[PDB]
Design a protein around this ligand. Structure first.
Ligand SMILES: [Fe+2]
Ligand SMILES: [Fe+2]
Lengths: 194, 195
């Protein structure tokens, strides 16, 4: 049975179990891929399956390597940096070339899972060319409130579906802040890409 | 008597001669600064005087270090004057335009010369910068015709920029652009890639 770590050694089984079928079937034709521009130059799109999000959370909860600041754990702390590098350069980068006029992805700065809970958010620019934000658990069923305010766009984005990703410019044009949750737990996967 | 190189040794005289009066008079109050958003998140604004642009072209034409046909500012001893300009004058305006974004460092600063025998391969591209400054150094229609810039993502053609006016836009991701060919004369621009 394929696991999160079997990429790209078991690439075919990995894509079927972990990549969202709408994203996987549009790898070579993103023009008919159903993504949404939630505000100017900011896009929401299905990327990962619920099984991916569930197992990522399980790895992070089991490791208990959270920072003692925003509660997070780096992907490389659980041995998933090489798998994520493959995801970015082979799956995310072609979609970035489609969304942002053939922009070529250079390198990965950071990749981590953030856990918002009750026991544990200023406006800022990201240290990235573009930032990925994947919702790992379900709004309403597992947490309330939360989301992200794009300050410049005057647009608040909340209630992202499980496995859907939000992509936005890191610097200059996408000033933003995370908004707190009011109950439950909210897990997200964040990556800063140059 | 003050020259381009006398910054910041003769700062007051340098600002009066080389900084556009509209920009110089709004250094501490940018909300009333008459700049134009020509397309989404792309702004055109006056920055330099005709004397600045005239003297920069003279320095580049006399140096004849052209090798796009461009010359870097450090090749004529103007890089540190430009470093002062970006951090003391441009950086506060960038914070006003782009939600308090702090300027980190200057990647490149150079003057480009377009002419009939050297129009360059006007290919679409992103810039290796967070934001890019593009200052028009000579007069549209008088010293060259056509030319300009096309913002491909914005679907906006930008032509006929006035002398000493700057265009600022994102370098990566969100401002895919290309220069437009000239039909006569010579077109000089001052470009800086800033992180
Ligand atoms: Fe952020
Ligand atoms: Fe450019």
């Amino acid at each position: 049975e394929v696991t999160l770590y079997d990429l790209p050694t078991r690439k075919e089984e990995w894509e079927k179990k972990y990549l969202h079928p709408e994203f996987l079937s549009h790898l070579q034709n993103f023009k008919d891929f159903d993504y949404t521009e939630i505000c100017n130059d900011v896009y929401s799109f299905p990327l990962f399956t619920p099984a991916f999000c569930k197992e990522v959370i399980e790895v992070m909860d089991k490791a208990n390597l959270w920072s003692k600041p925003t509660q997070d754990t780096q992907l490389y702390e659980v041995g998933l940096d090489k798998q994520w590098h493959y995801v970015v350069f082979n799956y995310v980068a072609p979609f970035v070339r489609h969304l942002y006029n053939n922009y070529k992805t250079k390198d990965i700065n950071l990749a981590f899972v953030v856990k918002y809970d009750m026991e544990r958010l200023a406006p800022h620019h990201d240290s990235s060319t573009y930032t990925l934000n994947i919702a790992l658990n379900e709004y309403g069923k597992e947490y309330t409130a939360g989301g992200c305010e794009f300050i410049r766009h005057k647009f608040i984005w909340q209630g992202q579906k499980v496995g859907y990703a939000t992509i936005h410019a890191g610097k200059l044009l996408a000033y933003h802040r995370a908004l707190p949750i009011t109950s439950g737990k909210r897990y997200i996967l964040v990556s800063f890409v140059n």
